[PDB]
Amino acid sequence: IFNSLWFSLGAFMQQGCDISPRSLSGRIVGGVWWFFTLIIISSYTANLAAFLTVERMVSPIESAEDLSKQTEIAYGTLDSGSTKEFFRRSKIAVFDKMWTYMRSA
Amino acid sequence: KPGVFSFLDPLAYEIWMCIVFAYIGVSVVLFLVSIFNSLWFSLGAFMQQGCDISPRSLSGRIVGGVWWFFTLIIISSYTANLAAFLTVERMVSPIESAEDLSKQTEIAYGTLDSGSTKEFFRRSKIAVFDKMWTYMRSAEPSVFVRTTAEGVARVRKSKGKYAYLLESTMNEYIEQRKPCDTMKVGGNLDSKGYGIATPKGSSLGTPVNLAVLKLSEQGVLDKLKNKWWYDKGECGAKDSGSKEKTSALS
Amino acid sequence: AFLTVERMVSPIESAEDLSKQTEIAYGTLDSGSTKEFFRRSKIAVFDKMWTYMRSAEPSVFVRTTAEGVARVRKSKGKYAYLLESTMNEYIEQRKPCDTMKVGGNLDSKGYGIATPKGSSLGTPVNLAVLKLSEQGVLDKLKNKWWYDKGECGAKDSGSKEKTSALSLSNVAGVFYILVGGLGLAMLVALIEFCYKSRAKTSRRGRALLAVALNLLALLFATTAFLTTYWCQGTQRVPFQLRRFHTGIWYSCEEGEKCRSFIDLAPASEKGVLWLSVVSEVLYILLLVVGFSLMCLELLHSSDGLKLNAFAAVFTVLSGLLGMVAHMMYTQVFQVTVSLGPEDWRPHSWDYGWSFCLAWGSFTCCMAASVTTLNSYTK
Amino acid sequence: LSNVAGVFYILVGGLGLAMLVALIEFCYK
Amino acid sequence: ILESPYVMMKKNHEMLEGNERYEGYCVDLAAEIAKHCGFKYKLTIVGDGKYGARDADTKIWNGMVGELVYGKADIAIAPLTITLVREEVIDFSKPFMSLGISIMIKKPQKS
Ligand SMILES: C[C@H]1CC[C@]2(OC1)O[C@H]1[C@H](O)[C@@H]3[C@H]4CC[C@@H]5C[C@H](O[C@H]6O[C@@H](CO)[C@H](O[C@H]7O[C@@H](CO)[C@H](O)[C@@H](O[C@H]8OC[C@H](O)[C@@H](O)[C@@H]8O)[C@@H]7O[C@H]7O[C@@H](CO)[C@H](O)[C@@H](O[C@H]8O[C@@H](CO)[C@H](O)[C@@H](O)[C@@H]8O)[C@@H]7O)[C@@H](O)[C@@H]6O)[C@@H](O)C[C@@]5(C)[C@@H]4CC[C@@]3(C)[C@@H]1[C@@H]2C
C-alpha cells in the first residue's frame, strides 16, 4: 500500500525484493504475478524474432518470373503500347502467365 | 481459434508433466541443510528471484546450482520453439481420409441428394463407407444438398464444419475458382473413369479408342490437363499457396 | 536458427520439386518405360528431370528394382526412386518399412486383362472388369493383398505425428547430470558429518602439492609440444585410401613417413601464427617463473607467503596466455580446414590425444592455485 | 568462434588492465 | 508372371497342385473371372520372365503377349500396363487398376 508497490517492482520483471513472504499466502501472491510477467516477455522476443527474420526473409524481386510466382504485388503496363502488346505477343510461359494475370488483375 | 490448451504448444505435454515431476525432487535435499520450506526455496531456483537459504560451501550448492542451470536451458528452448510456431505457421488440415469422418463427428459431411456419389455409400459394403452412410442418413439437418454449388456454399457457410464429396477433377477446378477458400484433401475413395463413348458397332469406335491410348501416352492429355485447370485455373497453386506474410501477436 | 530451418525444410511431394532442388538425387530403373517416360515427355519439368538424370553422376539408374529400394535406404533420403504406385503401396508394407510413397502419380497407367485380339471370351472378361470394379470387389481385394497381406499396418500409415513439438529425449541427456549431480552430492553430505565429528602438515603438505601439480602442468605442456598426431587425416577415396597422421607441427603421413608442413597460408593467418608461437611459449616461460619462487619456498621449508602470492600471479598469467594459446591453434585449425587443407584434409576430423592431455596441463596450473592461497589464510 | 574470439581481447585485456589497478592501490594505502 | 502381391508362390507349393500352387492378387481375380465367364482356368508362369515386350530386331513378341499372339496361351491375367503397341496385336479389357509413376522416397527417421 505504501512500500509494497516498490516491492512489487521486485516482482515487476526481475531484481528480487527484500520483503520475503516465506510460508504464508504472500508466496502465492508474489509468485503467480511473477509467473505471469515472464509469459509476456518470453512471447515478446519470439514475436520480435518472427518480425526481424521475415522482414529480412522477404527479398526484393529482380526478375519478372517472381511476378509469375507471387501474387501479392500487382503489376501492369500502360493501357496502350507495345509494352502491353509484348506480353500479349510473347509465347514464353512466364510472359504469358503475367499476361494471364494482368487480364485477370 | 486458439486459446487455453493451445498455449501449451512449444513445450510438449509429456514435458509439461516432467518439468513438474523433476522439480519436486530438488527441494528434498536442501531440507537437510537447515520438505516443508525448501519447496518455496526451490521457487527461488525455479527460474529466478534468488532465495534466502544459502548453501555456501556444502553439497547443496551443487543441488541449488545444477537445477538452476537446468531451468535456464528450457526457457531459451521454449522461446526458440515459440518463434518456430510464430514464424512457420503450418496450418494443417485436420483430416485426409474419409475413415476419419467415420472416426470423428464434429465436421458434417454429405453428397449431392441424387447421383452415384450418394449411391456409392448406399452400395459400398465396406464398414467405413457404410458407417458414413449410417451417419449421413442420421445427419440432421440434411447434409444432402440439392445442387453442387449448394454443397460448395455449405462448406463455406459452415466454415470447415461441413465436408462435401465431389469428383477430384471438379475438385481441382473449383479449388482454382475464386474466392478459392476450398481445397481437395486426401485421395479418391474409388476409381471412376471418363471414357469417350461411341454407339455399339460403330466403325469409328476403335480408332477413337486407339487415340485415347496414344494421346494419354504422349502426355498430350496431361498438357491439356495443365491447360483447363492450371492455365485456365484462376488461383495458381504455387502462386496462391505462397501468399502469407502476416503480422503481430494474437 | 536450428528449430526454424528444421521446420522450414518441407518434405517434397511433386516431382517438380526435384526439378527445383538438387540435393536429393533421383533416378529410375536402367531399362523400362519409366526411364523412357522422361525420355519421351516433352513437358519442361519432366525433360529437366531427364536432363538431370543424364547428368546425375554417379548412376542414379539402378540395375534392379530392389537396388533402387536399397539406394534410397543406403543414401538415407538423399536418393529418390520412381516406381509404380501399387508396388509403392506394397513395398511400403514390406518390412523394415523405412520407405514410403509421396505425392501422386506422374502419369496415368492401367493394368488391363489381355486376351486374343478378337477372342469372343474377350468381351465377357471385359464386362467382368466393369462389374467387379463397379461393386468394389476389386477394392476389397485391394485391401487383401496390400493391407490384409500388408505387414506394416492396415490404418497405421496415418498414425505418425506430422507437426509435433519439442522432444523429451533432447531433455533426457541432461537428466544423468541432474540425477548424478544429486547422487554425488549425497556422498559429500554424509562424509562432512564425519569431518565435523572425526577430526604444520596442513599449510605445507598442501603447498607442496601445489608444486607437485605444477610439475604435471609442465609435463603435459610439453606433450602437445609434439602431438603424435593431431588428426587422423583421411582422404579415403574408394584413387586409394589415404590416412594422414598429422601432428600439431609435423604433419606426418602414413608405409610410415613424416613431414613438417608447418606455417600454412594466408598471411593474416600467419600473423596469427607468428602470434600463436608467442602465446605457446609465454605459457611455458611463465611456468618456470612459477617454479622459481616455489623453489624459494623450499628454502623457507629448509618474505615467505608474500613471494608465494607473487608466484600465484604468474601461474595464472601463464595459463591465461595458454588459454589464448589453446584457442590460437584450434581456431587456426578451424581456419585451415576452411582452406580445405592442401593435401591432408580429414574426413576423420578429430583432435589429437595430447590435446586432451594438454587440457590437464591448465587445470593443474589452477589446482595448484586454489591451494597455494589456502596457506595464505594463515 | 571468431565471433566469440573478438571478445577475448577485451576479456584478457580487461584482466591485464585490472592487474595494474591492484598493484598501484597497494601503494596508495 | 510371378509378381508380388499379384502372383506369388505358396509355402507349400510343392504340396499343392496346379492353380493352388500360385497365390496372389491375380489368383483371386481368376476365380472371379471363372465365376463370371464359367470356365476352368490354368494359371501358368511365363518362362522368360518378360511381360510381353516387342523385340526390335526379330519383331517377335516375347513374354506373355507372344504367348497370346502365337497361340501358346489363351488369356493373360497379370500386371500388364496397357500401351498402344500391345493393343496392336492383342485385346485388353478395361483398366481395372489405374496407376502411374509414383515417388518412392525414405520415411522421416525416428532419431
Ligand atoms: C519356337 C516358336 C517361336 C515363335 C513361333 O515359331 C516357333 O512363331 C509363332 C507364330 O506366331 C505362331 C502363332 C501364329 C498365330 C496363331 C494364331 C492362332 O489363333 C488364331 O486363330 C484362332 C485360333 O486358331 C484364334 O482365335 C481362336 O480362339 C478364340 C480366340 O479368342 C476365337 O474366339 C476363336 O474363334 C471362335 O471359334 C469358334 C467359336 O465362335 C469360338 O470358339 C471362338 O469365338 C478362334 O478359334 C477358331 O475359330 C474358328 C472360326 O473363326 C477358326 O478355326 C479360327 O478362327 C479364324 O482363324 C483365321 C486364321 O486365319 C481363319 O482365317 C478363319 O477362317 C477362322 O474363322 C480359330 O482357330 C485367333 O484369334 C487367331 O487369329 C493360335 O491358335 C496359334 C498361333 C498363335 C500360332 C501359335 C504358334 C506360333 C506362336 C509360332 C511359334 C511360337
Structure, briefly:
This is part of a larger assembly, with five copies of chain A. The first copy, chain A, contains four helices and no strands.
How does this structure look, described?
The structure is cut from a larger assembly and holds 5 copies of chain A. In chain A, 51% of the residues lie in helices and 0% in strands. The first copy, chain A, has 4 helices and no strands. Chain A has helices spanning 4-7, 26-57, 82-89, 93-102. In chain A, α3 (82-89) crosses α4 (93-102). Chains in contact: A-B, B-C, B-E, C-D, C-E. The complex binds Digitonin. Digitonin sits between chains C (116, 118-121) and E (69-72). Chain C: It is found in: Cell membrane; Postsynaptic cell membrane; Postsynaptic density membrane. Chain C: The record marks 12 as: Crucial to convey clamshell closure to channel opening.
Largest interface: C-E, 68 and 49 residues
The coarse silhouette of chain A is rod-shaped
* SS summary, helix count of chain A: 4
Structural class of chain A, by secondary structure, is mainly alpha
Report strand % of chain A: under 5%
Order of helices and strands of chain A: HHHH
Supply Rg of chain A.
29 Å
Span from first to last CA of chain A?
63 Å
Helix content of chain A: 40-55%
Write down how many β-strands of chain A occur, each being a DSSP E stretch of 2 or more residues.
0
Biggest sheet descriptor of chain A: none
Protein name (chain C): Glutamate receptor 2
Organism (chain C): Rattus norvegicus (Rat)
Site (Crucial to convey clamshell closure to channel opening) (chain C): 12
Binding site for L-glutamate (chain C): 33-34, 84
